[PDB]
Design a protein around this ligand. Structure first.
Ligand SMILES: Nc1ncnc2c1ncn2[C@@H]1O[C@H](COP(=O)(O)OP(=O)(O)O)[C@@H](O)[C@H]1O
Ligand SMILES: Nc1ncnc2c1ncn2[C@@H]1O[C@H](COP(=O)(O)OP(=O)(O)O)[C@@H](O)[C@H]1O
Ligand SMILES: [Mg+2]
Ligand SMILES: [Mg+2]
Lengths: 242, 242
């Protein structure tokens, strides 16, 4: 879980980099094949652009083959009671908060069955919690983290965050009383290695891990957060039956 | 060991790619800053080269931060008896050969103490063995893998393979009766993801793993092999005392 779950993080970062990287790479390929058309065989600039083109084909290939390997990781999708899951999380959740941070937990009606890798959801939810914990250091006394497990019908899902709800849906939400996330950053936030926290503190690994896990679990994740009025990360998973 | 040692491989590939990649990247940077000097602000080609330059600064950074994370892995350097190590390896070595492949094992005099991660050397030696096993499928009946644990004085080391021997030195060697490795390829052989074996079979992971482990262990690795007269991979580690 610090060894087996570092292996896990590598999976989810490798998957996200692969996405960012390949988009960048396309930008580069477009531009370079454009320059090659401008400055072909005869031009002094052709050799330099070609050498770059072919040396880039090589550097990209290594990266592609590494990322692809660096994912190839294993998951046990269990049927899990959603409530029973969070009740056992409560203990670590209590462990890492303490100090001041008031914690309030809120279990809804008719709490659904959900298909997922248990150890993954643990991490997902812990990453969110730790995030919420650092987001309220400033209030000392104010800080107030709130996690809200619940059911949701297709309609209740859409307004809460998830546009593409087929039918019923399971819902987790780690809220907080922090400063919130400015619009400037809200887009870049699950980006691998993105952080506002300084060099030695921040890594930018956490939410890429979360994003990957949610996506990995047939799931949608969505945030609403205003400036000054605290963050709130919400996870949506499909309900299970058989 | 299939989970904990996939994590291990990621370490050693990430470390090797990092090396190859950074060399490629330099080639590209040289050429691109040259083109920017040729075609500056005013030139139509300046925008395309700059856009490429800055989008490349971004794609490289992700890769750098991933590789650097993707290594950060853990090792227990034990003092290990060199002979006692290989005797327990004999069992897996016997496991994976069988069929035809004649095996001969050869334990030298005064068999030294060596400082290393046990599970790593297991893998290193298994990767070599599996390699030797596939390298003699063609003789059916001929194939003959030979592993040769032994001591070596500084001089005996130099002629066997290792130029930079301080003093005494521990020596492992997995030889075979295969076709050998042509000069064309001998350079590219520990390169991450390099293989001659076709797409579905080969991965090119094995010897990058080995190279990394040897280097990881204050160690030198060297091969002599002629065309037609079978491969022979040799590992040199420093002897231990305290
Ligand atoms: N609950 C929150 N409140 C305010 N800002 C947040 C919260 N969670 C995440 N962020 C912002 O999003 C960034 C990305 O999160 P993460 O991937 O965990 O980075 P880090 O690991 O450095 O915190 C953080 O660096 C932070 O700037
Ligand atoms: N004992 C050997 N005899 C002949 N060729 C070898 C031997 N060991 C390695 N090679 C060559 O070196 C390449 C690299 O080895 P490795 O990294 O294990 O690649 P792979 O995993 O595909 O075998 C092999 O693909 C093969 O072409
Ligand atoms: Mg975090
Ligand atoms: Mg191999």
């Amino acid at each position: 879980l610090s060894q087996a779950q570092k292996m896990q993080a590598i999976g989810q970062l490798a998957g996200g980099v692969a996405h960012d990287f390949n988009n960048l790479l396309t930008a580069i390929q477009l531009r370079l094949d454009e320059l090659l058309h401008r400055h072909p065989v005869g031009d002094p600039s052709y050799e330099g652009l070609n050498e770059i083109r072919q040396t880039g084909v090589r550097a990209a290939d290594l990266v592609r083959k590494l990322l692809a390997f660096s994912r190839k990781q294993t998951v046990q999708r269990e049927v899990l009671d959603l409530g029973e899951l969070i009740s056992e999380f409560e203990v670590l959740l209590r462990r890492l908060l303490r100090e001041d941070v008031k914690l309030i937990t809120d279990y809804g009606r008719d709490l659904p069955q959900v298909r997922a890798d248990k150890s993954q959801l643990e991490t997902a939810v812990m990453n969110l919690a730790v995030n919420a914990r650092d987001a309220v250091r400033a209030a000392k006394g104010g800080g107030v983290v709130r996690i809200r497990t619940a059911r949701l019908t297709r309609d209740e899902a859409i307004q809460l965050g998830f546009p593409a709800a087929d039918g019923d849906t399971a819902f987790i939400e780690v809220s907080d009383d922090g400063p919130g996330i400015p619009p400037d950053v809200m887009g870049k936030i699950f980006d691998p290695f993105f952080t506002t926290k300084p060099v030695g503190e921040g890594t930018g690994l956490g939410l890429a891990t979360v994003y990957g896990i949610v996506k990995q679990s047939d799931g949608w994740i969505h945030v609403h957060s205003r400036p000054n009025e605290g963050a709130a990360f919400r996870i949506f998973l499909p309900v299970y039956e058989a």
